[PDB]
Amino acid sequence: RLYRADSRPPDEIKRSGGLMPRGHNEYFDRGTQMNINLYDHARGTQTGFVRYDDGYVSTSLSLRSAHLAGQSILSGYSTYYIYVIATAPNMFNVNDVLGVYSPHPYEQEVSALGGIPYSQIYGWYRVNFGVIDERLHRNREYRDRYYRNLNIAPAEDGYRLAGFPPDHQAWREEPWIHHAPQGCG
Amino acid sequence: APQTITELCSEYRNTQIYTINDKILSYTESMAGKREMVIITFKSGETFQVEVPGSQHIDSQKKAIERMKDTLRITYLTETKIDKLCVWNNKTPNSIAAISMKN
Amino acid sequence: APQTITELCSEYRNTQIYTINDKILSYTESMAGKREMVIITFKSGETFQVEVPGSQHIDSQKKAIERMKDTLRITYLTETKIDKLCVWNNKTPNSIAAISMKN
Amino acid sequence: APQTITELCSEYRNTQIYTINDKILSYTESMAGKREMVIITFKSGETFQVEVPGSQHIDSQKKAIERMKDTLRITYLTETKIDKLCVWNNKTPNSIAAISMKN
Amino acid sequence: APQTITELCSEYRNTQIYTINDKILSYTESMAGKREMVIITFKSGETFQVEVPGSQHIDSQKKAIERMKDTLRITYLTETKIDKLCVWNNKTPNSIAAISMKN
Amino acid sequence: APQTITELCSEYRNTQIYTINDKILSYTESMAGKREMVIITFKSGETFQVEVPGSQHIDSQKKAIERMKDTLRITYLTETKIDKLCVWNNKTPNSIAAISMKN
Amino acid sequence: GDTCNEETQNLSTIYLREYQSKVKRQIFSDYQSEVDIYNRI
């Protein structure tokens, strides 16, 4: 599973249809041409939020990594939650897709294109004064059978989606050359 | 006029309440002649059927047999937990007379 | 025609509105002969049935009875919130005449 | 045949097109004798019905009435926006003749 | 019997395959008398209909027209892409004879 | 009665169990006269059909053919893995007699 | 040039639209109720 600390409460997440990128109102909302760019997302920082701009929502590979980021960004919050998320092909491993151009490689983030739907959230832990209450609340709307097999998108499918500016050296080198969009490199 | 599946189940000869409290493990549906039935199994290893339509079944029961097969398919697909089953224990596999689901 | 469930409930004798505002707590479906019915319960403590069709029912109500059992199975499986119930309270359990859901 | 809901609606006398562009606010479903109908309303305050099968209906319309009640229940539950409604405006609530949705 | 929609469509006079590979953009459904039909459009500008059951419809096709309208309603609501359509080109809008979807 | 699909299948002539353990790749649905059928394929290359309600079908079988088509559309749309198919192997494409789904 | 960033936003939205339809196929199918076609016809 993947983990993300966030101050938006479970009921706010249900009402929006999931963990939304910055500015995106609810999950199926087509009423805004949202900029979606992995390179841009991976280099951004938002105060009070683990990276969630430029159409992606960042997550961590472990509960401990999610709490560390949670305590760096949301410190002193009387409450925040760590959501436990199933792997599915809307998720991309940032290091794998951006390679040597990955901006925070030590972070080991896995980012979800367009946000994480509410049915993809397996459950959440409440974090009080920075201490994780270890009782996981399960999301009864989680679709167990569907997400049970699924895994993150292979890097091969995200190279075309990396979003490096047209002039970036990456578009002229391996592996992105072989997946370069029209007008890049 | 029963208010619960135990009440209802006790009105017939040869019935038994089963507490399952689990979701369906497998669903089988046959359209093979003389065997137009649905068989469901549980992790418990318990097997149940919705019996084939036949001349002994009055049209009210014919519509209710088709409703029960609809209920078992969407229960399996939604992974919904079944609480109890009232069955005719006189057949193999035991035939469903009624189903309850809680929560 | 009436325009709300409270207006429609008022045209019938032996009816009352229950404000539920909650999802169904349990769902029981029977295909046992002569008691092919659905029974639903809520956390508030009330039990309601969809009556076995018979001859208190015009042919028009027979399609409608089947539709109501379809609606109650979906609202139960999906934890959809029911707003109000119009029921005939001269039956045990009280019998459903109409249902409303508000978004 | 017509290609749009407006072209369809104007082949009939006493019809009107409503632009809704919104999801359904409440759904009421009745199995009460002689009032077997569905009523839907919008946050605008507009109320519409799928009328009771009756004499004004040709034989072919009866399966189309049942399909329309099926479309309105799944549209309400999935919160899909309705684009426009073609309604008969000679009765209250106005009665639905056709519905369009666009994605 | 045919193994694909192209093979099946070839068995008929006045049909043509359209490769759509896109989701339905709008869905219209009518219960108005003599126009009990569904119309669907695509962002390409193409419009297709499921025709009113009629004189040139053998009775096995009647239960299949009904199924096709149900398939089109849920394909539209889930935004599933239609791959190909086999259509009769001697009707305006062209009339749907078969549908395929993959993945 | 049988308690398993391999044992239900075992009892007819010209049947074959196929272990699939995969979701459906494509679904084709036809309402063309005399080709009112569903064809499903798997990525492995297997194509199976639900036969056109022919003469060798009893009426219990008419309703069961309709149910099987309903199951295959909902299985395709929800991408549910099919475990095994019992098929008549003297038809081309092989014709479905029963399906099982597990977990 | 501008094509590289438009193309990126465009291949990203198509990948998103397709995953959103899989999600609607999961959650909306819970609402799909089968019709007895023989009875209604």
Residue type at F6? Answer: T
Burial D47-69 (b: 16+ CB within 10 A, else e): bbbbbbbeeeeeeebbbbbbbbb
* Total length of chain E: 103
Q: Which of D63, D67, D77 sits opposite G31 (nearest CB)?
A: D77
DSSP D57: S
- Quote the CA–CA distance of G23 and G16 in Å, as a whole number: 11
Interface test with C, best of B4, B57, B62 (most C CBs within 10 A): B4
Annotated binding site of A: 4-18
Q: Which of G17, G21, G35 sits opposite E66 (nearest CB)?
A: G35
- Quote the CA–CA distance of F5 and C58 in Å, as a whole number: 42
Burial F90-100 (b: 16+ CB within 10 A, else e): eeebbbbbbbb
Could you write out the DSSP letters of every residue in D59-88?
TTHHHHHHHHHHHHHHHHHTTPPEEEEEEE
- Quote the CA–CA distance of C102 and D10 in Å, as a whole number: 32
Instruction: Provide, as residue numbers in chain D, all residues whose Cβ is less than 8 Å from the Cβ of G31.
Output: 74, 77-78
Whole-Å CA distances, A95 to A39, A60, A98, A110: 11, 12, 5, 8
Could you tell me the two tokens for D38? 């569905």
CB pairs under 8 A between C and D: 87
Q: Phi/psi at B38 (nearest 5 deg)?
A: -125, 135
- Alpha helices for chain C (secondary structure H): 5-9, 59-77
Q: How was this structure determined?
A: X-ray
Residue A55 zone, left/alpha/beta (φ > 0; ψ -120 to 50; rest)? left
CA A120 to chain centre: 12
* Contact state of G27 with A119 under an 8 Å Cβ cutoff: yes
Whole-Å CA distances, B90 to A5, A150, B61, B93, B98: 55, 43, 18, 9, 15
The resolution of the experimental structure, rounded to one decimal in Å, is 2.0
Around E97, how many Cα atoms within 13 Å sit in the side-chain half-sphere? Answer: 26
Question: Which one, of A10, A1, A17, lies nearest residue A86 by Cα?
Answer: A1
- Quote the CA–CA distance of F89 and D22 in Å, as a whole number: 51
DSSP A28: T
| Residue A150 contacts residue A86 (beta carbons within 8 Å) | yes
Whole-Å CA distances, A77 to A48, A51, A135, B15: 10, 18, 19, 58
Instruction: Provide, as residue numbers in chain D, all residues whose Cβ is less than 8 Å from the Cβ of E48.
Output: none
Instruction: Provide, as residue numbers in chain F, all residues whose Cβ is less than 8 Å from the Cβ of E101.
Output: 26-27, 76
Q: Find the radius of gyration of the CA atoms of chain C.
A: 13
Number of domains making up chain G: 1
Beta-carbon count within 10 A of B69 CB: 22
Kindly give, in sequence order, each residue whose CB lies less than 8 Å from that of residue A28, ignoring residues fewer than 6 positions away.
A17, G20, G24
Q: Which of A89, A157, A161 sits opposite G8 (nearest CB)?
A: A161
Kindly give, in sequence order, each residue whose CB lies less than 8 Å from that of residue A183, ignoring residues fewer than 6 positions away.
A166, G1, G2, G3, G4, G6, G7
Which residue is listed with tokens 């549908």?
Answer: E99
Closest residue in E to F28 (Cα–Cα): E100
Q: Which helix (H) or strand (E) holds F49?
A: strand F47-50
Beta-carbon count within 10 A of A85 CB: 29
Instruction: Provide, as residue numbers in chain F, all residues whose Cβ is less than 8 Å from the Cβ of A146.
Output: 78-79
Strands F47-50 and B26-30: unpaired
Catalytic residue among A26, A109, A134, A156: A109
Whole-Å CA distances, G39 to D52, E86, F54: 18, 28, 19
Instruction: Provide, as residue numbers in chain D, all residues whose Cβ is less than 8 Å from the Cβ of G33.
Output: 70, 73-74
Which residue is listed with tokens 């507490």?
Answer: B19
* Contact state of B66 with F65 under an 8 Å Cβ cutoff: no
State the residue range of the domain holding G7. 1-41
- C8 Cα to chain B: minimum distance (Å): 25
- Quote the CA–CA distance of D86 and B37 in Å, as a whole number: 43
Residue type at B92? Answer: T
Could you write out the DSSP letters of every residue in A93-129?
EHHHHHGGG-SSGGG-EEEEET-EEGGGEEEEEEEET
CA E34 to chain centre: 18
* Contact state of D3 with E39 under an 8 Å Cβ cutoff: yes
Q: Which of G28, G35, G41 sits opposite D78 (nearest CB)?
A: G28
- Quote the CA–CA distance of B49 and A3 in Å, as a whole number: 42
Residue type at A117? Answer: P
Q: What CATH number is attached to the domain comprising G9?
A: 1.20.5.240
SS3 F65: helix
Residue type at F83? Answer: D
CA terminus-to-terminus distance, chain F: 23
Q: Phi/psi at A4 (nearest 5 deg)?
A: -140, 130
Helix B59-78 with C59-77: angle, nearest 10 deg = 20
Could you tell me the two tokens for G4? 């590289």
Q: Phi/psi at B5 (nearest 5 deg)?
A: -65, -30
Give residues preceding each break in chain G, C–N over 2.5 A.
none
- The verdict on whether A134 is a catalytic residue reads no
Residue E8 zone, left/alpha/beta (φ > 0; ψ -120 to 50; rest)? alpha
* Contact state of F86 with B32 under an 8 Å Cβ cutoff: yes
Q: Which helix (H) or strand (E) holds C97?
A: strand C94-102
Q: Which residues lie across from B17 on neighbouring strands?
A: B86
- Quote the CA–CA distance of F76 and F68 in Å, as a whole number: 12
Q: Phi/psi at D5 (nearest 5 deg)?
A: -65, -35
Which residue is listed with tokens 């983030």?
Answer: A109
Instruction: Provide, as residue numbers in chain G, all residues whose Cβ is less than 8 Å from the Cβ of F66.
Output: 36-38
Q: What angle do CA E86, E91, E93 make, to 5 degrees?
A: 80
- Quote the CA–CA distance of A114 and G15 in Å, as a whole number: 9
CB pairs under 8 A between E and G: 28
- F19 Cα to chain B: minimum distance (Å): 13
* Total length of chain B: 103
Its sign, for the CA torsion A170, A172, A175, A178, is positive
CA B44 to chain centre: 16
* Contact state of F60 with B53 under an 8 Å Cβ cutoff: yes
Q: Which of G24, G32, G35 sits opposite E79 (nearest CB)?
A: G24
Beta-carbon count within 10 A of B45 CB: 7
| Residue B20 contacts residue B85 (beta carbons within 8 Å) | yes
Interface test with B, best of C28, C90, C94 (most B CBs within 10 A): C28
Closest residue in C to B64 (Cα–Cα): C31
On the question of a cis peptide bond just before residue A9, with omega within 30 degrees of 0, the verdict is no
Closest residue in B to C22 (Cα–Cα): B103
Give residues preceding each break in chain E, C–N over 2.5 A.
none
| Residue E60 contacts residue F34 (beta carbons within 8 Å) | yes
Q: Which residues lie across from F26 on neighbouring strands?
A: E102, F41
Positions of E strands within chain B? 15-23, 26-30, 38-41, 47-50, 81-88, 94-102
* Contact state of C5 with D49 under an 8 Å Cβ cutoff: no
- Quote the CA–CA distance of A102 and A95 in Å, as a whole number: 6
* Contact state of D66 with G32 under an 8 Å Cβ cutoff: no
Residue type at B65? Answer: I
Question: Which one, of E70, D33, D90, D47, lies nearest residue C100 by Cα?
Answer: D47
Kindly give, in sequence order, each residue whose CB lies less than 8 Å from that of residue F28, ignoring residues fewer than 6 positions away.
E4, E5, E8, E98, E99, E100, F38, F39, F40
SS3 F44: coil
Q: Tell me, letter by letter, the H, E, C secondary structure of E19-30.
A: EEEECCCEEEEE
Residue type at F103? Answer: N
- Quote the CA–CA distance of D95 and E12 in Å, as a whole number: 40
Q: Find the radius of gyration of the CA atoms of chain E.
A: 13
Question: Which one, of C44, C90, C1, lies nearest residue D30 by Cα?
Answer: C1
DSSP E44: T
* Contact state of E31 with D3 under an 8 Å Cβ cutoff: no
- D30 Cα to chain G: minimum distance (Å): 18
Interface test with G, best of E57, E69, E78 (most G CBs within 10 A): E78
Kindly give, in sequence order, each residue whose CB lies less than 8 Å from that of residue E28, ignoring residues fewer than 6 positions away.
D4, D5, D8, D98, D99, D100, D101, E38, E39, E40
Question: Which one, of E88, E66, G27, D74, lies nearest residue F29 by Cα?
Answer: E66
Instruction: Provide, as residue numbers in chain C, all residues whose Cβ is less than 8 Å from the Cβ of D76.
Output: 101, 103
Domains of chain A: 1-185 (3.90.210.10)
SS3 A88: coil
| Residue E96 contacts residue E15 (beta carbons within 8 Å) | no
Chain A within 8 Å of F80 (Cβ-Cβ)? yes
Residue type at E37? Answer: M
Chain G within 8 Å of F60 (Cβ-Cβ)? no
Instruction: Provide, as residue numbers in chain C, all residues whose Cβ is less than 8 Å from the Cβ of B98.
Output: 28-32
- Quote the CA–CA distance of E94 and E37 in Å, as a whole number: 13
- B17 Cα to chain C: minimum distance (Å): 13
Whole-Å CA distances, C26 to A2, A81, A93, B101, C60: 34, 31, 43, 6, 28
- Alpha helices for chain E (secondary structure H): 5-10, 60-78
Could you tell me the two tokens for D2? 């017509």
Kindly give, in sequence order, each residue whose CB lies less than 8 Å from that of residue G9, ignoring residues fewer than 6 positions away.
A33, A35, A36, A37
* Total length of chain G: 41
- Quote the CA–CA distance of A88 and A146 in Å, as a whole number: 9
Beta-carbon count within 10 A of C78 CB: 17
Kindly give, in sequence order, each residue whose CB lies less than 8 Å from that of residue G14, ignoring residues fewer than 6 positions away.
none
Q: What angle do CA G38, B34, B12 make, to 5 degrees?
A: 85
Chain D within 8 Å of G23 (Cβ-Cβ)? no
- In the stretch 34-53 of chain D, residues with CB closer than 8 A to chain C read 34-37, 39, 47, 49, 51-53
| Residue E50 contacts residue E96 (beta carbons within 8 Å) | yes
- F49 Cα to chain B: minimum distance (Å): 13
| Residue C93 contacts residue C49 (beta carbons within 8 Å) | yes
Instruction: Provide, as residue numbers in chain B, all residues whose Cβ is less than 8 Å from the Cβ of C33.
Output: 12, 58, 60-61
Q: Phi/psi at A152 (nearest 5 deg)?
A: -60, 155
Residue A153 zone, left/alpha/beta (φ > 0; ψ -120 to 50; rest)? beta
Q: Which helix (H) or strand (E) holds E40?
A: strand E38-41
- E58 Cα to chain G: minimum distance (Å): 13
Could you tell me the two tokens for E67? 């199924």
Domains of chain D: 1-103 (2.40.50.110)
- Quote the CA–CA distance of C94 and C14 in Å, as a whole number: 10
* Contact state of C34 with B60 under an 8 Å Cβ cutoff: yes
Whole-Å CA distances, G12 to A177, B39, E45: 18, 44, 25
* Contact state of E63 with G37 under an 8 Å Cβ cutoff: yes
